[model samples]
Target: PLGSAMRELLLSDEYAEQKRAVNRFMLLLSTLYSLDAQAFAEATESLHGRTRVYFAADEQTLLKNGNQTKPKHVPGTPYWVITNTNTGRKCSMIEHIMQSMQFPAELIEKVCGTI
Candidate 1:
């Protein structure tokens, strides 16, 4: 039922707008991350472990110009996005962390099932 609810929310126009806003925000964040490698590393290493953190390569300093890895937008990282529920209020979600985190999913499923 929660999945169905999420699906409905995803299909709504409000969700679409929120998704775009989140995308723009992520792009800006990514650009900032590229411009300052040391700061980025420090910030990420603080939140995530230093050994586990991998920073995306700068777009301008790629070995090959056309390399896929040189793309400005890297896939498979967490980014923030706003979600508008049926109740017509907006809330933010962290996409990358949300997908990787097991605890939140377990909690949501447990609560939904109980209800």
Candidate 2:
């Protein structure tokens, strides 16, 4: 069992390489969610009305129903320039939206990781 195999370790011990903290946590979170699909679904449902991604207003919503024959990178969200903290914030929001939507894990990794 993952619980039995887990061991406590200092933050420094796990992150001596400096990037392990965030990477490790994310991988672990992914593992935990994959281990129980229902739990993932439940958590995702809880985020239903929360902020997320470029389509926060809906892809076909009023006054924003255009994708110019190029709806978006995927699922009709479109591409646009973003700067500073705005870029980072949009990315995080998109990632959260992907997770909440229960998008294929590999797809999220590839697309999100690629970007």
Candidate 3:
């Protein structure tokens, strides 16, 4: 199976052996708690590692299937689609991105002024 071959490669190295044991224990706990695999992966990676995880996929699914979504990333940024909570208006602009985290106001004006 292609998946089996991929798994073999993934767990081949000495580092892979250690990581697999750790992840096996993690997967055990995930099943015990009935956790969603995606959520478990996110919490595990972010909580123990230096990576910052985001839940934008879940937010987008909510938006596509219904009408609700959330801004849960760092400093309150959306995953891929940026939105204005007050007006429920949205756009994907470099200016809008810089403005989201309360960046230098005049800098956006200076850079995207011509656009």
Candidate 4:
């Protein structure tokens, strides 16, 4: 599902540039994989009144500008990217998980499936 969504988004006009598309793909993958299960559960319980664990930036500062102190729309910045019509209000979880994983560009499809 995520693979198809990322593929569609990568090809869409919104991310026409190859670099932007790659960044988006990487961000999505990073967000999905780097979630802290316990913290997410607690935050969801406190904020949304449910145990639903969805990705979100750590704070408004991080949300406005990425954790790297870069502008919000920069290549690696995390943002609330809505990829699906059915999944409501998912956010991007920022972490260095992408760097740790060392995913190859060619295996994006497989990585998407894993997420």
Q: Which clashing pairs does model 2 show?
A: 72-78
lDDT of 2 by residue, 1-115 (tens): 4232112211235423436333433333344354454554454344322222232223343114333321222212122211112334434543574576455566545433322
Q: How badly does each model clash, as a count of residue pairs?
A: 1, 1, 0, 0
The regions of model 1 sitting more than 4 angstroms off are: 1-19, 48-115
> Least accurate stretch of 10 residues (summed lDDT) in model 1?
83-92
Q: On residues 15-80, what C-alpha lDDT tens digit does candidate 1 reach at each position?
A: 445444434334434433444534444443333222222233443433232233213334333322
Flag clash pairs in model 3. none
Off by over 4 Å in 4: 17-68, 71-105, 109-115
List CA RMSD, all candidates. 12.8, 11.6, 18.0, 12.1
Q: Give the TM-score of candidate 3.
A: 0.22
> What Cα-based lDDT does every candidate model obtain?
0.34, 0.36, 0.32, 0.36
lDDT of 3 by residue, 4-115 (tens): 3323433445324534332332222323123233443333333210222222334553355323333332222223221322221221133343344334665435433222
Superposed model 2: Cα runs more than 4 Å off: 1-21, 48-50, 53-115
| Model 4 residue 62 lDDT score | 34
Give the per-residue lDDT digits (tens) of candidate 4, residues 5-30: 54555456644543543355444544
Residue-level lDDT for 93 in candidate 3: 34
